[PDB]
Structure formats: structure tokens, C-alpha cells
Curated annotation (Swiss-Prot), chain A:
Domain of life from the UniProt record: Eukaryota
Protein name in UniProt: V-type proton ATPase subunit C 1
Biological role: Subunit of the V1 complex of vacuolar(H+)-ATPase (V-ATPase), a multisubunit enzyme composed of a peripheral complex (V1) that hydrolyzes ATP and a membrane integral complex (V0) that translocates protons. V-ATPase is responsible for acidifying and maintaining the pH of intracellular compartments and in some cell types, is targeted to the plasma membrane, where it is responsible for acidifying the extracellular environment. Subunit C is necessary for the assembly of the catalytic sector of the enzyme and is likely to have a specific function in its catalytic activity.
Intracellular or extracellular location(s): Cytoplasmic vesicle, Secretory vesicle, Synaptic vesicle membrane; Cytoplasmic vesicle, Clathrin-coated vesicle membrane
Native organism taxonomy: Eukaryota, Metazoa, Chordata, Craniata, Vertebrata
Swiss-Prot record, chain D:
Record function comment: Subunit of the V1 complex of vacuolar(H+)-ATPase (V-ATPase), a multisubunit enzyme composed of a peripheral complex (V1) that hydrolyzes ATP and a membrane integral complex (V0) that translocates protons. V-ATPase is responsible for acidifying and maintaining the pH of intracellular compartments and in some cell types, is targeted to the plasma membrane, where it is responsible for acidifying the extracellular environment.
Disulfide bonds: none
Expression by tissue: Expressed in brain (at protein level).
Similarity annotation: Belongs to the V-ATPase E subunit family.
The name this protein goes by in its record: V-type proton ATPase subunit E 1
Residues modified to Phosphotyrosine: Y53
Compartment annotation: Apical cell membrane; Cytoplasmic vesicle, Secretory vesicle, Synaptic vesicle membrane; Cytoplasmic vesicle, Clathrin-coated vesicle membrane
Assembly and binders: V-ATPase is a heteromultimeric enzyme made up of two complexes: the ATP-hydrolytic V1 complex and the proton translocation V0 complex. The V1 complex consists of three catalytic AB heterodimers that form a heterohexamer, three peripheral stalks each consisting of EG heterodimers, one central rotor including subunits D and F, and the regulatory subunits C and H. The proton translocation complex V0 consists of the proton transport subunit a, a ring of proteolipid subunits c9c'', rotary subunit d, subunits e and f, and the accessory subunits ATP6AP1/Ac45 and ATP6AP2/PRR.
Length: 54, 140, 170, 54
């Protein structure tokens, strides 16, 4: 058992990016099962915070 | 099978002389002196430990099965920070991204790696997208 | 299965059974140690803070009023002086009315615990408090507050403490 | 160079607007918290003095 989390921008909106990938990887070529992952609206710090967090 | 245990009785001085000359004669003094408190204690203790092991096992297994859950749940929340933070760094500051979970089929890895590269190479191990692996082989 | 306390003068096996089934996974299976008791350490809020000041673990507040009704709160962080609200959403209020009832966090706001120099209070949502206790641990009050959506924890909105315990899971 | 400076200025503008929105969010939250605290302390203090006088 293994999972890959990925994240990508909404090409204009979130739904498009998931559907487009799910079509390629899951509907058509059947290389992986896939679904959305539900990260909430977390509160961003300034840039000098995030470069520490990573 | 090899040997026997026997009494000797002697004048209280002679213990050192006897045990030395017994070792010279390859006769082995079994160094023990009687106390009924201790001869009771052996028979208490190997029953007691066999009992206390059974008292503790139940609560220990419930504590492990609960705190594995609490530490596993904590792990998935740290992935959910790492995908968030890196998607705020590697994409534009106005937050507009989707996180996705993929579960690869057997032997299919290269084709999937290639498809993801084809889907995202324009955003430019390293990848042109935010990525982290969640294992589940906890028992190694 | 009834959990391994070091004592209690307020609680009984009726109450310990019904509580040990509700506490969060964070304390399931720990022995309960008495941090403070008005019946052993003397009756003041400064003492309750002073006795709580060394902890780093959840606590159970237990109260008995002058009508002998038992109620209180389970609180994720020690009772301490604060200028702002603190604690997290596993905090809850409970009451033996004489049914055991528990009022877990509603999701509406994060006003769990607060503690001035002269009072201690739990809940919020307007001028409401789910529980409030004075500097003497003598007067106290309960109203329905929107953090927990509780019933009135005592028989009366305004109550007098007969005695109070704080347990901790260590 | 200078278009990429304008991209950096747009990122700075986005940070300025974002952290301004965060400051508005924080101050609006701390307004409602200190309303709950101050109202609650003030009523409960005076109500209890009245209760003992009568």
C-alpha cells in the first residue's frame, strides 16, 4: 500500500484540475485510483514563516 | 543425567578446607544455605510474575491500540500542512489549488510518473508539482 | 474497568463509570490524581490556580453545590490566569441531573476557558457563561452559552459551591 | 529584469493586501472576544453586589 499526495493550481478553478487529471490517470489509462484531499482554509503567515515551515 | 547432589556435614571451620579440596578432587560445592523465607519466596515469585503479566497485558494492548490511532491521525495532519505550505510557496499567493490523492496500481509506476510529467511540466527527486508519499508498511 | 483513581469525596462508582466512557482518547487508560480539593487544600481560587500551575495535561473539574447536584467540566488545559480565552474543542461540560448528560462543543465559537484574578469561567456567546466561579469559590453561576449549548448545570442559575475537586490524568 | 520587478511588485501587492485582510480578520475577531469578556465581567460583578445588598 502506498499513496501519492499531489497538489496543483486550479487551471482556472479547483474542479477542472481534478477532473482533467482523473480523466487521464483514472478514467482512461487506469494507472491509479484517485480522489480529492480536503485541506481546510488554513491561515497564512508572512513569507519568512513559510520558508521556515518547509 | 550427569551428576548427583548430596549432603556433607562438618565442623564450622572446615568449609573452606573442604570446598577447596573438593575442587581439587573435582567435587563441586553447591554454594547455598537454608532459609525457609527464601524457599517460600521462589514459589511466590514465579506464580506472582505469571499473574502480574496477565494483569498488565490487557491495559497495555488497549493503550497501544488507542495511541497508535492518535499518533497515526497526527501524521496525516502533518502531511496536510506540508501540502498546504508548499502549494502556497510553489504556486501564486492568492490560494487557488486542489490537493489530490493518487494510489498507484501494481507495476504501473513509470507510466504514471510520465503522465504526471506530461500534465505539469509547464509549471517549471524533483517534480514540477507539489508531491509527498504516504507509506502504510508500518511493520517494515 | 472502573478507572484507577488515587481517591475522591465527591464522585462514586456511578459517576466514575459514566465519566470514564466519555473522556477523550488522550486520557483513556490513565490513573486519575487529585490536583486540588476544597475539602483538603482549603477553599480559594488563588489556591486552585497555584496547585494547577505545574501541570501540562487535561483536568476534570468536579463541583457539588448546596443542593448536592454534581456537575463540572473536562478541560483540555490546566486552569490558569489568562487575559484571553484558551483551550481546544475536546473541552466539554457535564451534569448529573440526576441523569448523566454531556454538552460537547457545538462548533459555534472557541470561547472554552478563561480565568481572571478574581473569577474562573467556561463558555461564552454574549454575556453568557456555561460556568462561572468567584474568587472565593463561594458564589457561582450557569446559563446556556453557545459554545456548548448546555442546560443550566445546577438546579438554579445562581448556586453556592458545597465542595469542588480538580482531577488530572498523570 | 524590469517586467520581473513588476511581477515581484505584484507579489508584494498581493502580500500587502493579504496581510491587511488577515489584520482585519484578527481585529474583528478580537473585538468580539473582548466584547464577550468585558460585558460578561461587568454584568457579573455588578449583579453580584446588588444580590448581596438586597
Amino acid at each position: 500500500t502506498e499513496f501519492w499526495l499531489i497538489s496543483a493550481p486550479g487551471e482556472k478553478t479547483c474542479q477542472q484540475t481534478w477532473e482533467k487529471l482523473h480523466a487521464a490517470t483514472t478514467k482512461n489509462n487506469n494507472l491509479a485510483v484517485s480522489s480529492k484531499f480536503n485541506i481546510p482554509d488554513l491561515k497564512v503567515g508572512t513569507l519568512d514563516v513559510l520558508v521556515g515551515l518547509s | 543425567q550427569d551428576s548427583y547432589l548430596c549432603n556433607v556435614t562438618l565442623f564450622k571451620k572446615a568449609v573452606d578446607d573442604f570446598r577447596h579440596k573438593a575442587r581439587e578432587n573435582k567435587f563441586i560445592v553447591r554454594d547455598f544455605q537454608y532459609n525457609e523465607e527464601e524457599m517460600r519466596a521462589d514459589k511466590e515469585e514465579m506464580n506472582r510474575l505469571s499473574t502480574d503479566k496477565k494483569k498488565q497485558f490487557g491495559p497495555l494492548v488497549r493503550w497501544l491500540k488507542v495511541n497508535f490511532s492518535e499518533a497515526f491521525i497526527a501524521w496525516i495532519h502533518i502531511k496536510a500542512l506540508r501540502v498546504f505550505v508548499e502549494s502556497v510557496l510553489r504556486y501564486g499567493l492568492p490560494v487557488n489549488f486542489q490537493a489530490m490523492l493518487l494510489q498507484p496500481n501494481k507495476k504501473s509506476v513509470k507510466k504514471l510518473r510520465e503522465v504526471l510529467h506530461e500534465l505539469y511540466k509547464h509549471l517549471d527527486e524533483y517534480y514540477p508539482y507539489v508531491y509527498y508519499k504516504i507509506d502504510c508498511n508500518l511493520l517494515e | 474497568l472502573p478507572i484507577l483513581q488515587s481517591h475522591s469525596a465527591l464522585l462514586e462508582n456511578m459517576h466514575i463509570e459514566q465519566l470514564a466512557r466519555r473522556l477523550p482518547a488522550r486520557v483513556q487508560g490513565y490513573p486519575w490524581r487529585l490536583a486540588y480539593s476544597t475539602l483538603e487544600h482549603g477553599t480559594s481560587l488563588k489556591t486552585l490556580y497555584r496547585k494547577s500551575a505545574s501541570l501540562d495535561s487535561p483536568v476534570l473539574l468536579v463541583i457539588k453545590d448546596m443542593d448536592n447536584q454534581i456537575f463540572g467540566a473536562y478541560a483540555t488545559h490546566p486552569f490558569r490566569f489568562s487575559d484571553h480565552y484558551y483551550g481546544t474543542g475536546e473541552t466539554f461540560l457535564y451534569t448529573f441531573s440526576p441523569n448523566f448528560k454531556v454538552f460537547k462543543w457545538s462548533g459555534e465559537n472557541s470561547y472554552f476557558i478563561n480565568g481572571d484574578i478574581s473569577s474562573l469561567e467556561l463558555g461564552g456567546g454574549g454575556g453568557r457563561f456555561g460556568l462561572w466561579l468567584d474568587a472565593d469559590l463561594y458564589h457561582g453561576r450557569s446559563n446556556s452559552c453557545s459554545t456548548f449549548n448546555n442546560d443550566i448545570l445546577s438546579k438554579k442559575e445562581d448556586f453556592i459551591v458545597q465542595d469542588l475537586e480538580v482531577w488530572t490524568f498523570e | 529584469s524590469d517586467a520581473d520587478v513588476q511581477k515581484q511588485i505584484k507579489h508584494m501587492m498581493a502580500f500587502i493586501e493579504q496581510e491587511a485582510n488577515e489584520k482585519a480578520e484578527e481585529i474583528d475577531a478580537k473585538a468580539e472576544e473582548e466584547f464577550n469578556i468585558e460585558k460578561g465581567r461587568l454584568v457579573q460583578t455588578q449583579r453580584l453586589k446588588i444580590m448581596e445588598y438586597y
